[PDB]
């Protein structure tokens, strides 16, 4: 009989891959799920141009 | 930068570290405040609390 | 016709202040409102015994 | 990038209905994200949800909580939508689209690719 | 969370037609990537236009430079502007963005009506 401290988990699987992303010059980028919990988020760079 | 109707133009980083709780640029019903430590402090008390 | 970037709180209110807390050798404290995004929490120490 | 769409004209009251298209011309395990919406004639727009060709994730019109389940078959390439207990005001004509989510250049966000369209009635 | 549109326009052959469509209190027009359709009865709405700012926008297929955007954040509203109306463009629009939980609104349908 114990108390349970902490619960790690060893496989997980994602869903709802959604990105954005605003050109340079702009700013950076923002969605709302960064703030949202039980979501993983990155922000970082990309070549843009006219094309 | 806008203030209590207060404008003035700002230089590039001294905006961005405002030691000040923030959110991004999107704009939502009940926003997700971000750093709210910043201007919430609780720190020790003589014992047994914190206030 | 210009875009916010950041928005940041000069006038911040606190509300429900609520606590949770483990004796020593139980363990570590802690409170559902830890995963909410609208509360700020912390973890310290204090006095405990017989008293 | 041909989508056609397919399906039954006629489904009765409180029954499941179910439409169907597929992708003519680009597999659907690429990552593309595949919906349908609907709108009556003269009626503004009004969507009801997309499938991803990756994962299988699905996020539907929050008006209808459980009455849409939006289906898949990857292997013969077609992705389906099955709106079950249909109501009476449900009469519209639907339409196939494929957009992006995943950050593809944003103007991909919004569905550049559509279908063809179905009249859909709910009579007796 | 909805947009409002506008339901009648009209403009002479050769002007700039203005398309209006308002968002919602609840949402902010510069933070928000617009997407414009074009819709004739009778044919699926093609995407004609993707408008965020003048360094962040993307045309349709095939559709002439004289179709630009704009927004007015004073007034929370973003823009269509078609100079130089030849008869082909005669349609209805449509706005439209995605929310928080990235679903999709549309408007009411701007029934544009070259004179």
């Known amino acids: 009989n114990m108390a349970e401290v902490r619960s790690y988990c060893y496989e997980a699987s994602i869903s709802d891959m959604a990105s954005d992303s605003r050109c340079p010059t702009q700013g950076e980028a923002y969605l709302d799920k960064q703030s949202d919990t039980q979501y993983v988020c990155k922000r970082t760079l990309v070549d843009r141009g006219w094309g | 930068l806008t203030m209590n109707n207060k404008h003035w133009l700002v230089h590039k980083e001294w905006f961005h570290d405002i030691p000040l709780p923030w959110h991004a640029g999107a704009d939502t019903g009940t926003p997700h405040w971000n750093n709210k430590e910043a201007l919430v402090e609780f720190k020790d008390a003589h014992a047994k609390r914190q206030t | 016709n210009m875009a916010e970037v950041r928005s940041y709180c000069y006038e911040a209110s606190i509300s429900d202040m609520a606590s949770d807390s483990r004796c020593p050798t139980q363990g570590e404290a802690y409170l559902d409102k830890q995963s909410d995004t609208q509360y700020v929490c912390k973890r310290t120490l204090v006095d405990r015994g017989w008293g | 990038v041909q989508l056609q769409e397919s399906g039954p004209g006629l489904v009765k009251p409180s029954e499941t209905l179910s439409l169907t298209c597929a992708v003519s011309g680009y597999s659907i395990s690429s990552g593309y994200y595949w919906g349908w919406i609907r709108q009556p004639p003269g009626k503004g727009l009004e969507y009801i949800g997309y499938?991803?060709?990756?994962?299988?994730?699905?996020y539907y019109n929050p008006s209808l909580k459980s009455r849409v389940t939006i289906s898949k078959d990857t292997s013969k390439n077609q992705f389906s939508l099955k709106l079950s207990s249909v109501t009476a005001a449900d009469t519209a004509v639907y339409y196939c689209?494929?957009?992006?989510?995943?950050?593809?250049?944003?103007?991909?966000?919004?569905?550049?690719?559509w279908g063809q369209g179905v009249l859909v009635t709910v009579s007796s | 969370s909805v947009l409002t549109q506008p339901p009648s326009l009209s403009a002479s052959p050769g002007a700039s037609a203005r398309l209006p469509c308002t968002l919602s209190?609840?949402?902010?027009?510069?933070?928000?990537?617009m997407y414009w359709y074009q819709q004739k009865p009778g044919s699926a709405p093609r995407l004609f236009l993707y408008?965020?700012?003048?360094?962040?926008?993307?045309?349709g297929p095939g559709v002439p430079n004289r179709v630009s955007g704009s927004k007015e954040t004073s007034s929370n509203t973003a823009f269509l502007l078609i100079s130089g109306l030849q008869p082909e463009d005669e349609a209805d629009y449509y706005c439209?963005?995605?929310?928080?939980?990235?679903?999709?609104?549309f408007g009411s349908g701007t029934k544009l009506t070259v004179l």
């Open positions: 209190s609840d949402l902010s027009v510069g933070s928000k990537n």
């Open positions: 499938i991803s060709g990756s994962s299988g994730s699905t």
């Open positions: 408008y965020y700012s003048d360094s962040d926008k993307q045309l």
């Open positions: 689209a494929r957009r992006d989510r995943v950050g593809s250049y944003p103007y991909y966000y919004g569905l550049d690719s």
């Open positions: 439209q963005v995605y929310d928080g939980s990235a679903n999709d609104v």
